[PDB]
Amino acid sequence: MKINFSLLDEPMEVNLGTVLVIEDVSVFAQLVKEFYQYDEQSNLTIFDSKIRSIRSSELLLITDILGYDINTSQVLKLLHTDIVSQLNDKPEVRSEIDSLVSLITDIIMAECIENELDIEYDEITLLELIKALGVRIETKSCTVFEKIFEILQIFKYLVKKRILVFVNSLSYFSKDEIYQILEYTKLSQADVLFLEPRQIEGIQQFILDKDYILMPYN
Amino acid sequence: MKINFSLLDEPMEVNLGTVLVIEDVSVFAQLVKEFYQYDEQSNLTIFDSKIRSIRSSELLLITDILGYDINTSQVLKLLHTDIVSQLNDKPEVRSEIDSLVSLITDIIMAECIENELDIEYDEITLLELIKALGVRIETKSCTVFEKIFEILQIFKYLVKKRILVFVNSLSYFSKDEIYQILEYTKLSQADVLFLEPRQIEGIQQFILDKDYILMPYNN
Amino acid sequence: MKINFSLLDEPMEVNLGTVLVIEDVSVFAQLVKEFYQYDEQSNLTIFDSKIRSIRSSELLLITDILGYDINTSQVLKLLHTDIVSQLNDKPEVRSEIDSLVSLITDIIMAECIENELDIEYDEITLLELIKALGVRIETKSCTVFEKIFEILQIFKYLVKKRILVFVNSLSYFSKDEIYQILEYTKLSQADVLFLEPRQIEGIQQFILDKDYILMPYN
Amino acid sequence: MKINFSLLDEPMEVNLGTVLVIEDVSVFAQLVKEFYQYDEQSNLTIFDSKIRSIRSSELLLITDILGYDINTSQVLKLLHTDIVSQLNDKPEVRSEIDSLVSLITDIIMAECIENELDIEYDEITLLELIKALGVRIETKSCTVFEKIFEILQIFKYLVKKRILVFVNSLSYFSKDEIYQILEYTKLSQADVLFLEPRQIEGIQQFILDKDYILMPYNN
Amino acid sequence: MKINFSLLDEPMEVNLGTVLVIEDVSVFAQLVKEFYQYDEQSNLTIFDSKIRSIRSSELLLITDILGYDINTSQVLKLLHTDIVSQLNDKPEVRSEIDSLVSLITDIIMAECIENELDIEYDEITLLELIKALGVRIETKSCTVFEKIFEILQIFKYLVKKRILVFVNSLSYFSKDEIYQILEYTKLSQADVLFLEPRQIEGIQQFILDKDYILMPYNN
Amino acid sequence: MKINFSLLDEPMEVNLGTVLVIEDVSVFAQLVKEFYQYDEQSNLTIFDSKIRSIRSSELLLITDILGYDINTSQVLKLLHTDIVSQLNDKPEVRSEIDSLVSLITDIIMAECIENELDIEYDEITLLELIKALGVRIETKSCTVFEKIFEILQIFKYLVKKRILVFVNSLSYFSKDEIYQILEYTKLSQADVLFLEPRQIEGIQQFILDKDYILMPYNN
Amino acid sequence: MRMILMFDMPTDTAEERKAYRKFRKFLLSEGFIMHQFSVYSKLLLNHTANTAMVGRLKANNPKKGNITILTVTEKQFARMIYLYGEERLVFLGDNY
Amino acid sequence: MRMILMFDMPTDTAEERKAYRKFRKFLLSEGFIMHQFSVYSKLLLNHTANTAMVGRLKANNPKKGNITILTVTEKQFARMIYLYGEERLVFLGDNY
Amino acid sequence: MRMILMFDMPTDTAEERKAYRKFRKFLLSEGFIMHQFSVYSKLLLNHTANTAMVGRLKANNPKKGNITILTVTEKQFARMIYLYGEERLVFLGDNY
Amino acid sequence: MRMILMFDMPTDTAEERKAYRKFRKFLLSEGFIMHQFSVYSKLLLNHTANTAMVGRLKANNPKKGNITILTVTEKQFARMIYLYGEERLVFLGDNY
Ligand SMILES: [Ca+2]
Ligand SMILES: [Ca+2]
Ligand SMILES: [Ca+2]
Ligand SMILES: [Ca+2]
Ligand SMILES: [Ca+2]
Ligand SMILES: [Ca+2]
Ligand SMILES: [Ca+2]
Ligand SMILES: [Ca+2]
């Protein structure tokens, strides 16, 4: 994947982990504004290997790592649908689940018939059992280093998002933690792009000078 | 639970079921209008043994039997709690249900471990199983008699309603059905007050003559 | 309009005001059950002058007169749309309304520009002006005799409802008030059908005997 | 409004804008984690002059500037009330608006009298006119600087938030923009605390060395 | 108002006065101890028609008749309000009292004008006149029967007490006095539950045999 | 914490100590009367950064320094809690106190065992030891300067008071004592507003001329 | 819209009496009629003239003056009962 | 039924002032609230209480006293607006 | 699911001691291991054997007996620190 | 971090009982609550307070005293279940 803006001479490719440093505060703030306004503004463009423009729905932009909720309505919907598909791939297990649900429905139905008030029921479904169990991704994160790892896991799980972008998220992690994040990104194959106001020493990064010239580093 | 109006000489007590028959259409319509407007009008006064006047929120007024909605969030919630208590009173049934939902939890847990993402859960409870089953009262196919009976059954579930009042609801039910309604009201202990223009034969009721004289009547 | 059930030999026509007395409590309660369940049960039928069955949406069934709210979402929607149509029928008046709304929008816009915080607005519409004014039918009813008159007015205003039905609603009104209700029904031309457990003296009504035979009265 | 952590010897006071620079990435990340988890962790303690510890509901934490939603029901409601007060401070403008809304009410009233049904209404007020206009803040085309400025403007509208805190928000703004933010914060009187890994040149700030020594710095 | 204990097969209803006779001294003493400790112990459960369990603050327990204090701030206050209502129901008496109070206020006002200092006052009301009179119930010379009768009269004045219970209070009263107490309880509508070790002859009561069998008894 | 009156062009902010000098006796007396009557009068308006107007209960007004009572139930209670916290911050001292209290409890327990009656107790705590010691502030021998200093020390203990205001209190203190009061107020962070008819030389203050012009003054 | 207006103010001072006369003359010039002392009413054509009249009345109110304003229907205006300060035969029934 | 009541009477004599104080105290005792001088209102439950109140007011009216009674709806009673206070030469200062 | 179980009861009565021995033998027969006095643990395969085991433990609890149950992960179980009852050289740093 | 703590020790000697009372009072003073005999728990804010608490518990452990420490999550600490109490011949009566 490649990103292109009017400041660059040629579009630079983003593969696996990528660190982009902008030495101009105006170009950095205007670039983040172009990231949040990407749907509104046509200046900033992104061309994949197919050389096709992507909608903002396919771009995942995350600034605050701790403030980003892992559990969402769409994420829980895709997770519950995934578990329902896994249970549907095995006929015998789903048959046993239908038998147990039939037994529980028979017991609760008998208790309802024992009551003096009329009771009407419909049925119990596997999706209602998963939602009743509260299946969700683990919400336990001790540090931002683990939270960003969970963000990379959920990002690699989401097929619709073709790119994940972090804005000034590298200032929290130590150099060694940055090395572990880069190695985990290379192992996960996902495309991650970082935007930093200042350069980081010891790691390979693309430095954008105030002259607008882009140069590789390490 | 005594109710009083300007037409009555002394406040009349309402215990269990009470059938109040108003032979005058003017006083009956005025009394029903005072029942709907009760918060606005000071003429009709309903007080308990403490002499404290009950609020209109504590008063439950019912005219259309089939048009009233018996299914509410509080009624269904307290009903699910009652079913959970009924299942909790039997140790064996609760143990079996714990075994079944237990096995289901084992299966779903295995399916979660098979996934690549780290997944956490808590439990599948009995109240969540009842809410997933969608237990509710069925008024769709119910006859008017069964509807009023279900209303008398859910009146115990309503916490805020102090007294239930029915307006001209005794015209639909046969004498035997009225006997069943009263005999069930004596067991339910709830306070029900019926208002009818014409007197019902065979049941004890309070009659208000066109002379504005209130008399007890056995038939 | 005519109504037909298995108990009647031939379907009886309901024109202007009609009083139907059922001398059997089981047939009366079962008839009201057939009225509320009319969508579910096919026993009770209604055939208009076109001899075409009507859906339950076209049937207006009202039991409690005081408990029936005159103001509803659909009623207020049709009323606001009607007033919007009346204002749209006159181009000059609507033009003046657009001018005044433009002046108010200019004043409030100037006050918004005077503020130090950025403010974004859309526009003001005639429907938002009617809903802001709270246009609704009069909710003042002193007695059930007036409330039933308002029910007849709103029923005559509603084109979708082909019939209005009252269940045991004649016990509240005096004989003279019943005469005024019948005369108002004949003047309004609307189709109203009453269901009473016992017969009323002094007025014309159809008496259904316990033998199931139907006979005219007065 | 003093904040205290185990690293500091004494609680540091936060008045108007305050720029806190932590040169250690471990202490900075741990402090930010203690800012998000503040209700759970007892290490970071923020108290007012009364020494009473403020709840996490009273604390306002902000990291993403453009991702935060500035438009809320309470903010828009209090903003509409502020606009109504601004229109009420001028008698002439209020009189003119009353005249215009009066004319519109006359027209709509005539249209209601032309109808066959009996129609009643009450009034068209100024708050209803503003709510019909849909007055709200526009963050769509706003730059990050204007976004943070609007956040500093709406912080007075927020009643429950005791203190506003920004996490690494000073990296986007130029030195002059930071001077405008601080100079505006001195006028707004609000308590804002910025947390940056690197020190900003030209502004007064509190620097925490890798030695865990806190020192005031003019530049 | 139904009460239930482990010894009973079904919860027994308490309406108006109810005489409960426990023939076993062990079950009687254990039941009384469960009445004093009721908040601590879950064995004895008293619930209303709503099935809601009443708090010990709502329960009124009485053993010593002459040792109980009938005069309280709330009882005397509500009693003074009741007397003020009785004086307000009669227009002529209220007019005369207003005239006399007007005369006294005129005299005291003249005496205040005669003084050198500037003096201001407000009014002398009827509640202040009753509080100055010191109206209260006299239990000093009252017999035990008149004491229990006054307790049944002030139970309507107590707002928070849901049910009144007497422990072995029927031993002092003669059969005729018990008939007067029950007949008055039927008019007062209050819920009173008496607990006696021995059965009383001539009155309807619930008997609990040493076999732990509960049976209704006419005599 | 900004205060505003009709005489001022813009609302003036009060941060830490603030010396307000009113050169006009009429505006000064009217402003003090508006300070005592503040709940009744709408002329003087004091609001915080939230623009919310503070109640008179939140406002603390002080004129007589030696006549004010510094010892209150809440002040002494919170002070005893502060002393208990100071003793809790030191583990060794708390351990020694626990040892001594254990010895005394052993002695008293032996004396209780020697008695014929069965006796039970619970514990002797540190707060009970401080309450038994009768720790309180001594204003009897205190000079006016030490009294105002103790008032500035206990203002942090008062939870409900939003702002402290002194009326003509700067006439007693020497310039150096005023410098100590202001320098201590800057450390205490409390909001104090002094009102004086005449300007004090050497301290920063806001001066209101007879022309009704408000100007900052360094001396 | 029937506008009922009550007017009051301390009359003790001469300036207060002059202001009262001026305000009363202003009320008469605006179309208001005095039914009794402090009692006045005027028929407003619509809500527009009512609002403008409210603004004008607020502008013309004298110092310490106090005005009460009430909106009343014609049926309520005809039901207005003014009593300015004992029947031998009392008839409950048709009045003959 | 919202009852608006205006009250006026010559106050010159001492007996007239005493009668005015007595009538005002009677109005306050009956549930009426004074919005301003001569201006009062009370909320009557129904038409019967309104008629009885009219008879009582006629009975308690002092000599030379004049009372104006107007019926207004409760919503119209809340609509009551109380206003409390074009010149070429404006003088701020001594009025000369 | 790692099930940590604490067990206690008054041991004064002889039948209480017998019941304590019986309950301990029942815990050993069910797969629980005693780490120390009153301290036991067992590894439950899933929430199934966990719920069933809770029911069984409630059924087998002796009179006046009291059992505390806690659910713990393997990482938390390995972090269990048991101390069974003053250093001259204190080292803050690498422990060498 | 939820700290579950079990405490046992031979109670036979009087000195051992006194040491048990002292250690229990020390546990109560440190914030630990006794769910049952030998069964206690306390909520530790973080890992540092947990380590310091471990050192303090090791320092305050009585002679022959034995303490079992287990870490459980706060949600798992709430999951703590306390249960308080197959025969062919059931005897209701004298046990013979
Ligand atoms: Ca769950
Ligand atoms: Ca379902
Ligand atoms: Ca709009
Ligand atoms: Ca409106
Ligand atoms: Ca008084
Ligand atoms: Ca006295
Ligand atoms: Ca103690
Ligand atoms: Ca002492």
PDB file of N, CA, C and O in Angstrom, chain D residues 120-153:
ATOM      1  N   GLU D 120     -55.926  23.900  19.112  1.00  0.00           N
ATOM      2  CA  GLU D 120     -55.364  24.740  20.158  1.00  0.00           C
ATOM      3  C   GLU D 120     -53.844  24.681  20.101  1.00  0.00           C
ATOM      4  O   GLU D 120     -53.260  23.676  19.686  1.00  0.00           O
ATOM      5  N   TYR D 121     -53.209  25.772  20.520  1.00  0.00           N
ATOM      6  CA  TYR D 121     -51.757  25.863  20.552  1.00  0.00           C
ATOM      7  C   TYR D 121     -51.356  26.686  21.770  1.00  0.00           C
ATOM      8  O   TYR D 121     -52.206  27.148  22.537  1.00  0.00           O
ATOM      9  N   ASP D 122     -50.048  26.866  21.949  1.00  0.00           N
ATOM     10  CA  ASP D 122     -49.570  27.649  23.081  1.00  0.00           C
ATOM     11  C   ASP D 122     -48.728  28.839  22.634  1.00  0.00           C
ATOM     12  O   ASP D 122     -49.215  29.974  22.616  1.00  0.00           O
ATOM     13  N   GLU D 123     -47.472  28.594  22.268  1.00  0.00           N
ATOM     14  CA  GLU D 123     -46.580  29.678  21.884  1.00  0.00           C
ATOM     15  C   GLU D 123     -45.409  29.121  21.087  1.00  0.00           C
ATOM     16  O   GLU D 123     -45.133  27.919  21.110  1.00  0.00           O
ATOM     17  N   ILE D 124     -44.731  30.019  20.380  1.00  0.00           N
ATOM     18  CA  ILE D 124     -43.452  29.734  19.738  1.00  0.00           C
ATOM     19  C   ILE D 124     -42.398  30.594  20.422  1.00  0.00           C
ATOM     20  O   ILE D 124     -42.401  31.822  20.279  1.00  0.00           O
ATOM     21  N   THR D 125     -41.500  29.953  21.165  1.00  0.00           N
ATOM     22  CA  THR D 125     -40.535  30.652  21.997  1.00  0.00           C
ATOM     23  C   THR D 125     -39.195  30.787  21.274  1.00  0.00           C
ATOM     24  O   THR D 125     -39.013  30.331  20.143  1.00  0.00           O
ATOM     25  N   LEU D 126     -38.241  31.432  21.952  1.00  0.00           N
ATOM     26  CA  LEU D 126     -36.919  31.630  21.366  1.00  0.00           C
ATOM     27  C   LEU D 126     -36.077  30.364  21.458  1.00  0.00           C
ATOM     28  O   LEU D 126     -35.324  30.045  20.530  1.00  0.00           O
ATOM     29  N   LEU D 127     -36.181  29.636  22.573  1.00  0.00           N
ATOM     30  CA  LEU D 127     -35.452  28.378  22.700  1.00  0.00           C
ATOM     31  C   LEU D 127     -35.949  27.354  21.687  1.00  0.00           C
ATOM     32  O   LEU D 127     -35.159  26.577  21.139  1.00  0.00           O
ATOM     33  N   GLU D 128     -37.258  27.342  21.425  1.00  0.00           N
ATOM     34  CA  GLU D 128     -37.795  26.460  20.395  1.00  0.00           C
ATOM     35  C   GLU D 128     -37.355  26.896  19.005  1.00  0.00           C
ATOM     36  O   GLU D 128     -37.194  26.055  18.114  1.00  0.00           O
ATOM     37  N   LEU D 129     -37.155  28.200  18.800  1.00  0.00           N
ATOM     38  CA  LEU D 129     -36.661  28.678  17.513  1.00  0.00           C
ATOM     39  C   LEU D 129     -35.203  28.288  17.307  1.00  0.00           C
ATOM     40  O   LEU D 129     -34.800  27.935  16.192  1.00  0.00           O
ATOM     41  N   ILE D 130     -34.398  28.344  18.370  1.00  0.00           N
ATOM     42  CA  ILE D 130     -33.001  27.935  18.263  1.00  0.00           C
ATOM     43  C   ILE D 130     -32.902  26.428  18.064  1.00  0.00           C
ATOM     44  O   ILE D 130     -32.090  25.947  17.264  1.00  0.00           O
ATOM     45  N   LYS D 131     -33.722  25.659  18.785  1.00  0.00           N
ATOM     46  CA  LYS D 131     -33.730  24.212  18.599  1.00  0.00           C
ATOM     47  C   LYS D 131     -34.215  23.834  17.207  1.00  0.00           C
ATOM     48  O   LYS D 131     -33.742  22.847  16.630  1.00  0.00           O
ATOM     49  N   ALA D 132     -35.155  24.601  16.651  1.00  0.00           N
ATOM     50  CA  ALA D 132     -35.584  24.362  15.278  1.00  0.00           C
ATOM     51  C   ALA D 132     -34.508  24.762  14.278  1.00  0.00           C
ATOM     52  O   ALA D 132     -34.415  24.170  13.197  1.00  0.00           O
ATOM     53  N   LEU D 133     -33.690  25.761  14.618  1.00  0.00           N
ATOM     54  CA  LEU D 133     -32.606  26.164  13.728  1.00  0.00           C
ATOM     55  C   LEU D 133     -31.467  25.154  13.739  1.00  0.00           C
ATOM     56  O   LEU D 133     -30.720  25.053  12.757  1.00  0.00           O
ATOM     57  N   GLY D 134     -31.315  24.402  14.827  1.00  0.00           N
ATOM     58  CA  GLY D 134     -30.268  23.403  14.916  1.00  0.00           C
ATOM     59  C   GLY D 134     -28.886  23.986  15.121  1.00  0.00           C
ATOM     60  O   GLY D 134     -27.935  23.600  14.433  1.00  0.00           O
ATOM     61  N   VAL D 135     -28.759  24.920  16.063  1.00  0.00           N
ATOM     62  CA  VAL D 135     -27.471  25.547  16.332  1.00  0.00           C
ATOM     63  C   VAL D 135     -26.548  24.545  17.010  1.00  0.00           C
ATOM     64  O   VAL D 135     -26.899  23.943  18.034  1.00  0.00           O
ATOM     65  N   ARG D 136     -25.359  24.360  16.440  1.00  0.00           N
ATOM     66  CA  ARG D 136     -24.377  23.439  16.994  1.00  0.00           C
ATOM     67  C   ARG D 136     -22.992  23.864  16.529  1.00  0.00           C
ATOM     68  O   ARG D 136     -22.846  24.622  15.567  1.00  0.00           O
ATOM     69  N   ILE D 137     -21.978  23.368  17.230  1.00  0.00           N
ATOM     70  CA  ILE D 137     -20.592  23.668  16.888  1.00  0.00           C
ATOM     71  C   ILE D 137     -20.163  22.798  15.716  1.00  0.00           C
ATOM     72  O   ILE D 137     -20.558  21.630  15.611  1.00  0.00           O
ATOM     73  N   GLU D 138     -19.352  23.365  14.824  1.00  0.00           N
ATOM     74  CA  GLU D 138     -18.875  22.662  13.638  1.00  0.00           C
ATOM     75  C   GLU D 138     -17.413  22.280  13.839  1.00  0.00           C
ATOM     76  O   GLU D 138     -16.529  23.142  13.811  1.00  0.00           O
ATOM     77  N   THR D 139     -17.164  20.989  14.043  1.00  0.00           N
ATOM     78  CA  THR D 139     -15.815  20.444  14.110  1.00  0.00           C
ATOM     79  C   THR D 139     -15.368  19.805  12.801  1.00  0.00           C
ATOM     80  O   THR D 139     -14.238  19.314  12.724  1.00  0.00           O
ATOM     81  N   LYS D 140     -16.225  19.798  11.777  1.00  0.00           N
ATOM     82  CA  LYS D 140     -15.916  19.069  10.550  1.00  0.00           C
ATOM     83  C   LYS D 140     -14.749  19.706   9.803  1.00  0.00           C
ATOM     84  O   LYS D 140     -13.778  19.025   9.452  1.00  0.00           O
ATOM     85  N   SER D 141     -14.828  21.008   9.545  1.00  0.00           N
ATOM     86  CA  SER D 141     -13.790  21.721   8.812  1.00  0.00           C
ATOM     87  C   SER D 141     -12.749  22.361   9.722  1.00  0.00           C
ATOM     88  O   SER D 141     -11.857  23.055   9.224  1.00  0.00           O
ATOM     89  N   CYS D 142     -12.839  22.145  11.031  1.00  0.00           N
ATOM     90  CA  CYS D 142     -11.971  22.832  11.976  1.00  0.00           C
ATOM     91  C   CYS D 142     -10.591  22.187  12.036  1.00  0.00           C
ATOM     92  O   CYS D 142     -10.457  20.961  12.021  1.00  0.00           O
ATOM     93  N   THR D 143      -9.565  23.031  12.101  1.00  0.00           N
ATOM     94  CA  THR D 143      -8.207  22.571  12.340  1.00  0.00           C
ATOM     95  C   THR D 143      -8.037  22.155  13.800  1.00  0.00           C
ATOM     96  O   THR D 143      -8.846  22.494  14.669  1.00  0.00           O
ATOM     97  N   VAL D 144      -6.974  21.388  14.056  1.00  0.00           N
ATOM     98  CA  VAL D 144      -6.716  20.882  15.403  1.00  0.00           C
ATOM     99  C   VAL D 144      -6.624  22.028  16.404  1.00  0.00           C
ATOM    100  O   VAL D 144      -7.113  21.924  17.537  1.00  0.00           O
ATOM    101  N   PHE D 145      -6.000  23.139  16.006  1.00  0.00           N
ATOM    102  CA  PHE D 145      -5.886  24.288  16.901  1.00  0.00           C
ATOM    103  C   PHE D 145      -7.259  24.865  17.227  1.00  0.00           C
ATOM    104  O   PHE D 145      -7.568  25.145  18.392  1.00  0.00           O
ATOM    105  N   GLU D 146      -8.098  25.050  16.205  1.00  0.00           N
ATOM    106  CA  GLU D 146      -9.455  25.533  16.441  1.00  0.00           C
ATOM    107  C   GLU D 146     -10.283  24.518  17.217  1.00  0.00           C
ATOM    108  O   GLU D 146     -11.212  24.897  17.939  1.00  0.00           O
ATOM    109  N   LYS D 147      -9.964  23.229  17.082  1.00  0.00           N
ATOM    110  CA  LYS D 147     -10.676  22.206  17.840  1.00  0.00           C
ATOM    111  C   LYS D 147     -10.343  22.293  19.324  1.00  0.00           C
ATOM    112  O   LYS D 147     -11.239  22.255  20.176  1.00  0.00           O
ATOM    113  N   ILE D 148      -9.053  22.410  19.653  1.00  0.00           N
ATOM    114  CA  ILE D 148      -8.661  22.552  21.052  1.00  0.00           C
ATOM    115  C   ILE D 148      -9.157  23.874  21.620  1.00  0.00           C
ATOM    116  O   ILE D 148      -9.515  23.954  22.803  1.00  0.00           O
ATOM    117  N   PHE D 149      -9.190  24.928  20.800  1.00  0.00           N
ATOM    118  CA  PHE D 149      -9.738  26.200  21.258  1.00  0.00           C
ATOM    119  C   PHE D 149     -11.228  26.083  21.555  1.00  0.00           C
ATOM    120  O   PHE D 149     -11.713  26.626  22.555  1.00  0.00           O
ATOM    121  N   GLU D 150     -11.968  25.373  20.698  1.00  0.00           N
ATOM    122  CA  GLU D 150     -13.385  25.147  20.961  1.00  0.00           C
ATOM    123  C   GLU D 150     -13.590  24.276  22.192  1.00  0.00           C
ATOM    124  O   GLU D 150     -14.587  24.436  22.907  1.00  0.00           O
ATOM    125  N   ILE D 151     -12.665  23.350  22.456  1.00  0.00           N
ATOM    126  CA  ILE D 151     -12.750  22.540  23.668  1.00  0.00           C
ATOM    127  C   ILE D 151     -12.521  23.405  24.900  1.00  0.00           C
ATOM    128  O   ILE D 151     -13.180  23.231  25.932  1.00  0.00           O
ATOM    129  N   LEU D 152     -11.582  24.352  24.812  1.00  0.00           N
ATOM    130  CA  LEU D 152     -11.369  25.278  25.918  1.00  0.00           C
ATOM    131  C   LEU D 152     -12.546  26.228  26.081  1.00  0.00           C
ATOM    132  O   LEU D 152     -12.792  26.731  27.184  1.00  0.00           O
ATOM    133  N   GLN D 153     -13.284  26.488  24.999  1.00  0.00           N
ATOM    134  CA  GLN D 153     -14.461  27.343  25.086  1.00  0.00           C
ATOM    135  C   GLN D 153     -15.657  26.609  25.679  1.00  0.00           C
ATOM    136  O   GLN D 153     -16.454  27.216  26.404  1.00  0.00           O
TER     137      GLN D 153
END
